[PDB]
Design a protein around this nucleic acid. Structure first.
Lengths: 201, 226, 63, 127, 97, 25
RNA sequence: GAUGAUG
RNA sequence: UUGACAUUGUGAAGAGACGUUUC
RNA sequence: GGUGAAAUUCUUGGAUUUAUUGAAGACUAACUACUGCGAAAGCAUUUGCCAAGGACGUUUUCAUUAAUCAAGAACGAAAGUUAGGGGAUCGAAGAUGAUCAGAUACCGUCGUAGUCUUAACCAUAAACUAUGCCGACUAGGGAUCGGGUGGUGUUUUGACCCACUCGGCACCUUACGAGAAAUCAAAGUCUUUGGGUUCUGGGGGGAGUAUGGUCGCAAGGCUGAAACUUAAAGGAAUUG
């Protein structure tokens, strides 16, 4: 509930006493029930396996990458998302990875990941036709819907409120140093307007 | 122009050659002439050091000048500074390439051009990309005025070349590859194997460039200089 | 500055939009067996001697 | 016997570079262009400006200690002309007559295989 | 009327021929229609061959050469005097000069 | 005038007859 | 390969 | 938000001032 | 740096030029031609995979199953449209420097949409050979691409060389013939007019316009008049 991607329940075998231990993964595309999932420094390069980043070749696509070895997954957990592996630095024990946002990090080779992409992709390309479908989406997320516009409020309620016409009155761009109660609008904006041109990354 | 400058600076001298010394570049033992020239560098002041700038700078040198005859004048070699011992610099092979004039003279019209390339690793863990070039030649007594080859031929000639290059580059070390390049041995192997497909001319190993080097071991470099 | 002398050995033709610039080849008196081609401004024949203010400027042709 | 550098003549239209370096390319011995010998923009690429520029390189290389220089001649290249400008031959001539020995000569224009699009449009420079 | 049987180009048995750019004005013209010349020259002009021999460190050094193939559009081929208007009977001739 | 530009003019003219007449629909 | 409208 | 002082120790280099040392 | 000459512009806070290394997208040079393939539009780096096709060889097989077509259908350059990705170069718009009587143009510098890719539309071009398709017949010469036959030809099965043949892209000479001429081996075998078949035209304008259908998200595509005006518009050659 409240999550676009499906989960997967994988049960391994406790290596120190006789019992079974169940673990919640996030399903990658193509993972089906009855499949065997191998996790370790010496597992193979198949979709669904949990390998360290230093143990996979360049160009691999992984998901649920942990940003320090032992955090149990941090970096690609939304539907349809993944991470690419650009390079290795054997001297420093560090790997270069491209994130879903276009950023580039350097994270330890010992950190883990799962091979593939998150299931449930393509979700945000079907319009919500109705206000009632947005109602039920957020009914299992949190209280953030509907949204009233500040410029329709009174001056007691918001920096934008008030006036014989509905208008901001001052630049909507707000200094990063602004204190709480002042930060409404665009915070620490490097530019503004319709984005024309190349990414300019 | 001399008198056209508008602003000298965005705001409102010593002779640099008094603080440099010369070094002596030395080729590896694969080549007859061990001396190739000299180069400058700033002295080893406190916040710098000569070796930190000498390391990793590349010098291109004619192969004829390394063997003793201007016949080989159409092939060049690249050497890379790896260690600075005393006042001379030691270098190791880095690649090879023809001269632009030599290559362009070979490319005449009324003949088909065949090229091939192959990525392989020598027995001492170097990775290389070797390039090859051939041409179709008129047969003696030929009346027809062009010497094109059918694409069936070109596919076979390109396949024979590819296997000779892999076979000859692996098993041999990089030094052993250099010793095969100078006598132009491979160009004679290709000729013998491509006879029954099509006659050819201007068969050459056009260039070779390194792609990845094994972790630097001092022993390797000293072996080729002592 | 020094000045060098040379001797016309052939008159090649005429140039300039209006013909007032003859073209000559010369042989330097000292250090002979060096020849240069350059332009001249008045009537000229073979065996004439020309005073060249700068020696090493070979002269272009308008055609 | 001989101390060798490398001389790079970039003979474009609109200017001509003559600048010598060490055999490794990283350190420069002297750099002087035709433009810093003439007063008018149109004469920068002229043979005479190339000749004066090369005579200063030879003067400086003598005192730094270079007694010979190889040569690499260049044009703009790429999508551009690929033909040497008016002043390339003058610089090469001037180095030879200044007392500097000449080694090898090579043309090092960048040739593009097949390349990105060329300036000017589909109908060219209409002039 | 029809001025030429070749339509001013060498295209028979093909639909399309990829374009090329002129070396002066950058105007696009199909390869088969462009005027093509192969220019080759010594790297050192005739006047300078002697002085370069004296300076040559090596004895008996063979002069390199420059090779380039040049493509002209019809307008820039007329102007540079590479081709010229030709009489009717003389237009049919194909042979070089 | 040139045939191409006359054709264009008639097109930019039809586009206007096509919308003024849309006011009565 | 600077400029040059009209009767 | 930035500087200084305390929490605050231990071994190396480069430079510097009238052996000790501060960047 | 740029030009015919310049200016805007970038540069002592290090530009242009030189060396070493790295990233991104596009493109496929020279070899490249009166050469190849495809229904046309179109197709050019290597290798592997999937299906397809012409010509040739054939003492295989079927036996009229065929030619050309209103309606109906698939594909269809560039630009253009909708939604993701990519976005390096070039660059409708736009912004600027110069030229000029003006210059909202040509020229110099920036630069959005576009240019590239996936899914889905569009249905146009000097889409040209301005030349419909199938068939038979009529003149001379040589070169080239693919297949086959003979020459144990000659250098080392292959590559060449001579003759011959089928199918192609074309080319040189000539007028039995055709045409108003330019020119044409088809545009010939048509007043000595008939091999089969499909499509289009009827002086120049108004007009590929208005109107009604129909197709498209839209730009638009297909179908498509009349009133009225007019003695000439036009094709190929000839002397100035």
């Amino acid at each position: 509930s409240g999550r676009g991607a499906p989960l997967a329940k994988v049960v391994f075998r406790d290596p120190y006493k006789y019992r079974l231990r169940e673990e919640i993964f996030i399903a990658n595309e193509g993972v089906h029930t009855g499949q065997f999932i191998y996790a370790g420094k010496k597992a193979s390069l198949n979709v669904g396996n949990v390998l360290p980043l230093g143990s996979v070749p360049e160009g691999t696509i992984v998901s649920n990458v942990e940003e320090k070895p032992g955090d149990r997954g941090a970096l690609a957990r939304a539907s349809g998302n993944y991470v690419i592996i650009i390079g290795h630095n054997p001297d420093e024990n560090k790997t270069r990875v491209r994130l879903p946002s276009g950023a580039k990090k350097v994270i330890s080779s010992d950190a883990r990941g799962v091979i593939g992409v998150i299931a449930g992709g393509g979700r945000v390309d079907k319009p919500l036709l109705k206000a009632g479908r947005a109602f039920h989406k957020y009914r299992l997320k949190r209280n953030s819907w509907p949204k009233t516009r500040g410029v329709a409020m009174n001056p007691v309620d918001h920096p934008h409120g008030g006036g014989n016409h509905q208008h901001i009155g001052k630049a909507s761009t707000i200094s990063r140093g602004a204190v709480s109660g002042q930060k409404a609008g665009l915070i620490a904006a490097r530019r503004t307007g319709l984005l024309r041109g190349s990414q300019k990354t | 122009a001399v008198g056209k400058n508008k602003r000298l600076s965005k705001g409102k001298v010593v002779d640099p050659f008094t603080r440099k010394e010369w070094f002596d570049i030395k080729a590896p033992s694969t080549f007859e002439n061990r001396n190739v020239g000299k180069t400058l560098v700033n002295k080893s002041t406190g916040l710098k050091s000569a070796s930190d700038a000498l390391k990793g700078r590349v010098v291109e040198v004619c192969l004829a000048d390394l063997q003793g005859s201007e016949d080989h004048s159409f092939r060049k070699i690249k050497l890379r500074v790896d260690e600075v011992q005393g006042k001379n610099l030691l270098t190791n092979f880095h690649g090879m390439d023809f001269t632009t004039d030599k290559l362009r003279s070979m490319v005449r019209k009324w003949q088909t051009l065949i090229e091939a390339n192959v990525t392989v690793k020598t027995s001492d863990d170097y990775v290389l990309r070797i390039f090859a070039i051939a041409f179709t030649r008129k047969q003696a007594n030929q009346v027809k005025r062009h010497s094109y080859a059918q694409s069936s031929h070109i596919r076979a000639i390109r396949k024979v070349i590819s296997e000779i290059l892999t076979k000859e580059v692996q098993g041999s070390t990089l030094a052993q590859l250099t010793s095969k390049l100078i006598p132009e041995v491979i160009n004679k192997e290709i000729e013998n194997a491509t006879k029954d497909i099509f006659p050819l001319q201007n068969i050459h190993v056009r260039k070779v460039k390194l792609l990845k080097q094994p972790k630097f071991d001092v022993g390797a470099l000293m072996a080729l200089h002592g | 500055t020094p000045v060098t002398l040379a001797k016309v050995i052939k008159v090649l033709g005429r140039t300039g939009s209006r013909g007032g610039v003859t073209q000559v080849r010369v042989e330097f008196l000292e250090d002979t067996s060096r020849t240069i081609v350059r332009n001249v401004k008045g009537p000229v024949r073979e065996n004439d001697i020309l005073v060249l203010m700068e020696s090493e400027r070979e002269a272009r042709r308008l055609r | 016997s001989q101390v060798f550098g490398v001389a790079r003549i970039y003979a474009s239209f609109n200017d001509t570079f003559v600048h010598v370096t060490d055999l490794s390319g990283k350190e420069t011995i002297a750099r002087v262009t035709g433009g810093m010998k003439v007063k008018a923009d149109r004469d920068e690429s002229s043979p005479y400006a190339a000749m004066l520029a090369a005579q200063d390189v030879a003067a400086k290389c003598k005192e730094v200690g270079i007694t010979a220089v190889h040569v690499k001649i260049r044009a703009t290249g790429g999508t551009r002309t690929k033909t040497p400008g008016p002043g390339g031959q003058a610089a090469l001539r001037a180095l030879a007559r200044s007392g500097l020995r000449i080694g090898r000569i090579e043309d090092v224009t960048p040739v593009p295989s097949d390349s990105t699009r060329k300036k000017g449009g589909r109908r060219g420079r209409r002039l | 009327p029809k001025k030429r049987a070749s339509n001013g180009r060498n295209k028979k048995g093909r639909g399309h021929v990829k374009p090329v750019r002129c070396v002066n004005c950058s105007k696009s013209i199909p390869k088969d229609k462009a005027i093509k010349r192969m220019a080759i020259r010594n790297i050192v002009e005739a006047a300078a061959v002697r002085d370069l021999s004296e300076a040559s460190v090596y004895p008996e050094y063979a002069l390199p050469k420059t090779y380039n193939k040049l493509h002209y559009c019809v307008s820039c081929a007329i102007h540079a005097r590479i081709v010229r208007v030709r009489s009717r009977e003389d237009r049919k001739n194909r042979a070089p000069p | 005038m040139r045939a191409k530009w006359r054709k264009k003019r008639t097109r930019r003219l039809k586009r206007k007859r096509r919308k003024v007449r849309a006011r009565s629909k």
